[PDB]
Design a protein around this ligand. Structure first.
Ligand SMILES: COc1ccccc1-c1c[nH]c2ncc(-c3cncc(C(=O)N(C)C)c3)cc12
Length: 271
């Protein structure tokens, strides 16, 4: 209602900062509390660069989905900058899977998780956005196994079909598509490749990918058509989808729209 009104800007003193969450595992991301609504929130901040932060904030102002961690506000009028998002009480999926009782987090739950994530990614796909760091460590868990994709530091709205990373830029090798590793070319399809790896993390309940292989041999192995083996207890149809996500030719990988209806159907069939 006033000249400098901005629907996302919050007054920093409105937020109580507590401690760095995820054991510093995510950088300057802290648990905090939004006093006025007595709400626990996650708050990412900056030290004393900024283009990246502003871009991340900008991206979050544009995406909204049940399975994408929701932006609640920002503090970007002056240092220190804040990106304020809802808090997911159970932390990240990688840790959640590694420490769970497997009769509780059963076969049907694994399908539920994949379905939620693929739903978030179908939404990004349709909006022509790419995530660029899909992995179990970047998904979050809420009540009743609610799962949400998080960490949009590398996300961006694409103008065309690919985005070329600057170079000298290093990536999380084990989750990176061949074309991305070799030519820094990212796209929705490179996110689909990462989703396939994420599915393997879900099927193994949090195991590190490419067991025993040196990060250095990864690309050569993929080039020979080596792919991770079917995890013990992973249904054949799920592994099939895994292999499809890892098709060498990006155009040969399924779309997230396809992946999602495939998972939603398997999820329902296991009621
Ligand atoms: C990927 O998450 C992020 C990456 C970058 C910026 C923000 C987040 C983020 C937003 N909401 C969150 N909620 C919980 C945790 C969270 C994850 N893992 C462990 C904890 C934890 O320590 N607790 C207290 C459960 C919390 C992390 C986030």
């Amino acid at each position: 209602g006033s000249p400098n009104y901005d629907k996302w800007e919050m007054e920093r003193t409105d937020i109580t900062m507590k401690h760095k969450l995820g054991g510093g595992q995510y950088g300057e991301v802290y648990e905090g509390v939004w006093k006025k609504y007595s709400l626990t929130v996650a708050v990412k901040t900056l030290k004393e660069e900024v283009e990246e932060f502003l871009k991340e904030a900008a991206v979050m102002k544009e995406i909204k989905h049940p399975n994408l961690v929701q932006l609640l506000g920002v503090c970007t009028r002056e240092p220190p900058f804040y990106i304020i998002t809802e808090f997911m009480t159970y932390g990240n999926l990688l840790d959640y899977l590694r420490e769970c009782n497997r009769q509780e987090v059963s076969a049907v739950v694994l399908l539920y998780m994949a379905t939620q994530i693929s739903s978030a990614m179908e939404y990004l796909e349709k909006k022509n956005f790419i995530h660029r760091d899909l992995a179990a460590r970047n998904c979050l868990v809420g009540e009743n196994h609610l799962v949400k994709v998080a960490d949009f530091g590398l996300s961006r709205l694409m103008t065309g079909d690919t985005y070329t990373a600057h170079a000298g830029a290093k990536f999380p090798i084990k989750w990176t598509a061949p074309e991305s590793l070799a030519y820094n070319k990212f796209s929705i399809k490179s996110d689909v490749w990462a989703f396939g790896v994420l599915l393997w993390e879900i099927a193994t309940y949090g195991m590190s990918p490419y067991p025993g292989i040196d990060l250095s041999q990864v690309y050569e192995l993929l080039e020979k058509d080596y792919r991770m083996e079917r995890p013990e207890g992973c249904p054949e149809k799920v592994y099939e989808l895994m292999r499809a996500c890892w098709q060498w030719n990006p155009s040969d990988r399924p779309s997230f729209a396809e992946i999602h209806q495939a998972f939603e159907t398997m999820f329902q069939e296991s009621s």
